[PDB]
Amino acid sequence: VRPFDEIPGNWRNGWLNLYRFWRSNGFRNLHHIMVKNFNKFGPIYREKIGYYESVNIINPEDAATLFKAEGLFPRRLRVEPWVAYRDYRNQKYGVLLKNGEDWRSNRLILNKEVISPNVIQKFVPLLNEVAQDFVSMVHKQIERSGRGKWTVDLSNDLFRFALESVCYVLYGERLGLLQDNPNPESQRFIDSVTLMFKTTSPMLYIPPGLLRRINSKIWRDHVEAWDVIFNHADKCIQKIYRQFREYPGVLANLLLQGKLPIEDIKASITELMAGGVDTTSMTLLWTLYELARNPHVQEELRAEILAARQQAQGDLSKMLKSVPLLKAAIKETLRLYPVAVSLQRYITEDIVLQNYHIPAGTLVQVGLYAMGRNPEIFPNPEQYNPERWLKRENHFKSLGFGFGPRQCIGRRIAETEMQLFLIHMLQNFKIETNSMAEVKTTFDLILVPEKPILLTLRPI
Ligand code: HEM
Ligand SMILES: CC(C)CCC[C@@H](C)[C@H]1CC[C@H]2[C@@H]3CC=C4C[C@@H](O)CC[C@]4(C)[C@H]3CC[C@]12C
């Protein structure tokens, strides 16, 4: 076992690395920086940038050793701006922000109503409804444009789908974002949500307290956005308590069981919504882009989906269990375009990775973006081939939703929502890339295309 002060990397120039990070770009190419640090220092490197320091690994085997020492209450990197808001408004921490036994106490209660197979089946009809209204929207636009084609950047529309779907199952109501003229309350709500994400980006590395001290508009807009979101939750709590005197949605059932305080219920319902809007819509954007750029894969998925429709006789539950290549396509999209460039875990016990001593408490990150594009771990990584996941075994290769007790609590909701989306979309339309020109990726909260993706939709 080699000492901890011998791990390769640049940790010996933490202040020079901070200057190199902010002098130009930097906060836009964190995923590209991760690739080179692995291609220069090997399967493990130790990084220090200012007061930030971490050990990074890329091999799935190493990720297994890491997830075995996360402890009973695993802890990742915190969302500085999001926590700052709860402290400023004296709001409770949700399941995403909590730690220690407080997180586990809440996580176990939330799991029953968010990720258990019992409630997943109660969501399929709700999600399918939203997915049916999305296909209706596309048909209208194809009518307007004429010639049976609609070339458009779907970024905004997918964001609406993700937000409409998530809020349907969380609050039990349709915001109506997919209409041509949504009501003002829902338009201001989606604008607040959008503004909430736009202001969180500059405060990922810029201390929120500093922006608050100078009364920056970035901090004030962040507070105004979260205010609208938390108010909307109260509106749904008030309407539910009035209906009191079925009950669809996570919010209603949590208020009926009453196992968590309403304050802790308000906090978790809000962080659940924020965790599945940008993530789901972006993953769908990359999926549609890769399908249009790999039309052969699109036909294969369309073939399997159509077959599943007949062999199920309308039964959605049966149909969702008959689309293996569709679930593999989701994995293949999250391999090339992970919503999180890395998973983080604070070590609770001394471990050894690549014959190196890793002291307890050290922050260790699993570079998802570097793993997905390494030819060693994935042969032909740059090819979008969903078959590489079918009848192959992995687990520690498909870490898109994390792993362990503190994995993504919405994975099944997202997987269902994206499967139902692709099912309805591929049954109705063919997606074609306007031009096979290359689209580069950039970092900003998640992996987003540097420039809008123009896709063409034709009825089929
Ligand atoms: C493509 C869709 C999605 C992707 C790729 C994704 C990815 C992730 C990842 C990687 C994590 C951290 C895993 C870890 O640290 O081990 C996470 C956590 C989380 N996700 Fe998702 N997510 C998606 C959709 C959703 C949805 C629809 C929800 C709805 C509630 C959601 C809610 C959450 C929450 C609350 C957490 C934090 C849970 C905790 O820390 O205990 N996500 N997600
Ligand atoms: C629970 C998480 C992982 C799911 C996705 C949430 C998205 C919207 C946001 C919220 C806080 C953000 C994280 C804040 C801090 C870091 C550490 C840095 O080195 C890379 C980005 C990373 C890791 C950000 C990634 C995206 C992040 C996780």
Phi, psi of 366, rounded to the nearest 5 degrees? -100, 110
Best probe residue, ligand 1, of 401, 407, 446 (max atoms within 8 Å of C-beta): 401
Contact (CB, 8 A) for 176 and 182: yes
**Any idea how long the chain is?**
460
Does any ligand 1 atom lie closer than 6 A to the CB of residue 401? yes
Residues 139 and 159: their CA atoms lie apart, in Å, by: 18
For the 4-459 domain, the top CATH level (class) is: mainly alpha
Distance 8 CA to ligand 2 centre (A): 25
Helix (H, G, I), strand (E, B) or coil at 147: coil
Does any ligand 2 atom lie closer than 6 A to the CB of residue 363? no
The residue written with tokens 């940790």 in the block is: 11
Does any ligand 2 atom lie closer than 6 A to the CB of residue 282? no
Helix (H, G, I), strand (E, B) or coil at 2: strand
What are the DSSP E strand ranges found in 259-413?
342-346, 351-352, 357-358, 363-367
Which protein residue's CA is at the shortest distance from atom 24 of ligand 2?
445
Which protein residue's CA is at the shortest distance from atom 26 of ligand 1?
276
Half-sphere exposure of 92 (CA within 13 A, CB side): 16
Distance 425 CA to ligand 1 centre (A): 24
Residues 344 and 41: their CA atoms lie apart, in Å, by: 19
The residue ranges of every structural domain in the chain are: 4-459
Ligand nearest to the CA of 345: 1
Distance 209 CA to ligand 2 centre (A): 19
Task: Check the CA dihedral 373-375-381-387 and report its sign.
Answer: negative
What approach was used to elucidate this structure?
A: X-ray
Q: Cα–Cα distances in Å, from 96 out to 100, 208, 408?
A: 12, 18, 10
Distance 23 CA to ligand 2 centre (A): 22
Ligand nearest to the CA of 343: 1
Ligand nearest to the CA of 276: 1
Q: How far apart are the first and last CA of the chain?
A: 61
What is the torsion angle, in degrees rounded to the nearest 10, for the CA atoms of residue 27, residue 32, residue 37 and residue 43?
Answer: 130
Ligand nearest to the CA of 75: 1
Parallel, antiparallel, or unpaired: how do β-strands 363-367 and 52-57 relate? parallel
Distance 6 CA to ligand 1 centre (A): 34
What is the crossing angle of helices 217-244 and 262-275, to 10°? 120
Residues 194 and 392: their CA atoms lie apart, in Å, by: 39
Which protein residue's CA is at the shortest distance from atom 7 of ligand 2?
445
Does any ligand 2 atom lie closer than 6 A to the CB of residue 445? yes
Residues 374 and 38: their CA atoms lie apart, in Å, by: 10
Q: Give the DSSP H or E segment for 98.
A: none
Does any ligand 2 atom lie closer than 6 A to the CB of residue 77? yes
